[PDB]
Design a protein around this ligand. Sequence first.
Ligand SMILES: Cc1cc2nc3c(=O)[nH]c(=O)nc-3n(C[C@H](O)[C@H](O)[C@H](O)COP(=O)(O)OP(=O)(O)OC[C@H]3O[C@@H](n4cnc5c(N)ncnc54)[C@H](O)[C@@H]3O)c2cc1C
Ligand SMILES: CCCCCCCCCCCCCCCCCC(=O)O
Ligand SMILES: CCCCCCCCCCCCCCCCCC(=O)O
Length: 564
Amino acid sequence: SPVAGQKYDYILVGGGTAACVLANRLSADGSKRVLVLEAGPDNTSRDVKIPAAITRLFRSPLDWNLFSELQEQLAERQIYMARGRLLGGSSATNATLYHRGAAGDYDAWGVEGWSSEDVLSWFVQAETNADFGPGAYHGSGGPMRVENPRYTNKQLHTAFFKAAEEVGLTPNSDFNDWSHDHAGYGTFQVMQDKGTRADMYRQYLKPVLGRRNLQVLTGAAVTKVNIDQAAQALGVEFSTDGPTGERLSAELAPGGEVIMCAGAVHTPFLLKHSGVGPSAELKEFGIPVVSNLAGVGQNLQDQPACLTAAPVKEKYDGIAISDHIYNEKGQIRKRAIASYLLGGRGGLTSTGCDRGAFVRTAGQALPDLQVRFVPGMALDPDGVSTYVRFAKFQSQGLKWPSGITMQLIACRPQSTGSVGLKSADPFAPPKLSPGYLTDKDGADLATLRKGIHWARDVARSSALSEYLDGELFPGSGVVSDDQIDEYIRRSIHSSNAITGTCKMGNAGDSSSVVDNQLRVHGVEGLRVVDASVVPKIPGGQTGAPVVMIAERAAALLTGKATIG
Ligand SMILES: Cc1cc2nc3c(=O)[nH]c(=O)nc-3n(C[C@H](O)[C@H](O)[C@H](O)COP(=O)(O)OP(=O)(O)OC[C@H]3O[C@@H](n4cnc5c(N)ncnc54)[C@H](O)[C@@H]3O)c2cc1C
Ligand SMILES: CCCCCCCCCCCCCCCCCC(=O)O
Ligand SMILES: CCCCCCCCCCCCCCCCCC(=O)O
């Protein structure tokens, strides 16, 4: 009805990170008619704009509120897996850390035309950096805004750095400079613009919404891609009125393409609902098989986390980031609001987890462990739960105790999971299994166990033991290797990556879902341009790599670049 009597050159399923980039580049010359379908609303919330309000976005209406299947290897728990639901997608709800990983991550993909030397200029072309000028590893002029964080905790950030040096880590002055090793300690840059969230809606989509050839629908939930076999994508079915709503169809112009941009959870889900998937699974829900692809929904990679936390001594009460945001009765400090509005500075600019380190726990080629230091104390062993608790704590009249947290992440994990269907209803949540700690060697568990040892060694250093008064998590009860393993099974949570569910592959790779041109095997006019295509997860947060893929895909589709 908003699409009745319209042919589109491109239909984007999802209005998230990759989609905002494609919408901008594909609508640019004005010849092409581009439709964007997003299930969630427009990007207008103040909780999106203020980085510290990430605490409020978890388990909110701007999240999909996805829970995994019971994981029997994780003390029979469901895992919450946060995902953004609005224009800008997970770029709008994320912790804003800017990581490319290492050159070696892209070389390890082994896909023709996607080596480190192929992808570097696409990272650089996207970037404007406030704190690095142009050079081999940094661009000036791209739409992304990257900066050094505008909040520093003078005592605790300094102390973490001195402690890391005491246990023998070297400083890394730029985690995105591929001329030096990934390992070491320092400051993560953030996708922020003077302390405001610089998401891909703000940077890519919002500036070009005036365009006549670009149509964006919100509250538009795609139910399947329409594919005919007389196999050719025709367009897309969606509802604007939830599950009971009338199914509408958006149709392609001749030579038009459907681009899947629904992310590493919802893209394989929708492909299965469209008959692109393993025949065994599709037959169980009476879905006609159009392209029998074993790899759709397999190879799910996510970077699991656990943490330590420790209170500061009574004489250091009031020095934590929790003290910079909340007063002793849980009111937001006037000083914090004033610094944010006057100069884009202070605690409201922080997502908390923007200092840390990459570490090799056992002489691996690339670091297996990421550390995120937070100058505030977790009150739950589940860091995402604690961020929720921090949002709900406002105006409750209590004091959040001053301390620190170290989050340990298996950043190059060996375990893989899957996403499938639990029902034939396209409005049902996916069957989601993260598969943490299932790798056959127990490498991921070993990484997190050694991470806890490492965090305890850092907290025992001169530089930090000056501040600290004991340990809250994992605590006195958790000392032996077997006690640590049990704590990890019970507390493990997502560091919120999720890639690889529609893996890109070389010719002859029967486990691949898309080729090196991002075309789905056995369907004409169907591409995937989102986190699902990443073959092997890079070390670090996965937002910047998604934008790099979307930039290169835009260049390919508009004839400006080739791959191979
Ligand atoms: C809490 C959190 C913290 C993170 N922290 C960081 C970080 O610090 N730094 C970093 O670089 N990365 C981080 N990430 C990861 C990064 O945000 C993602 O990897 C990246 O944004 C994914 O981009 P995408 O385009 O693949 O998907 P998304 O940005 O998730 O976009 C997918 C879109 O499809 C929409 N959609 C789904 N189903 C349908 C349907 N049926 N119809 C229509 N639309 C639909 C969704 O609502 C969504 O908007 C974080 C992620 C989360 C959730
Ligand atoms: C616990 C999490 C903190 C949440 C922060 C709430 C901030 C309330 C302060 C009053 C609103 C700030 C002014 C509105 C700024 C809108 C954002 C912007 O335009 O950059
Ligand atoms: C701006 C937020 C300040 C919050 C202070 C809360 C106290 C510290 C708890 C730290 C928990 C570990 C970090 C969890 C990171 C969650 C975000 C993410 O994964 O993207």
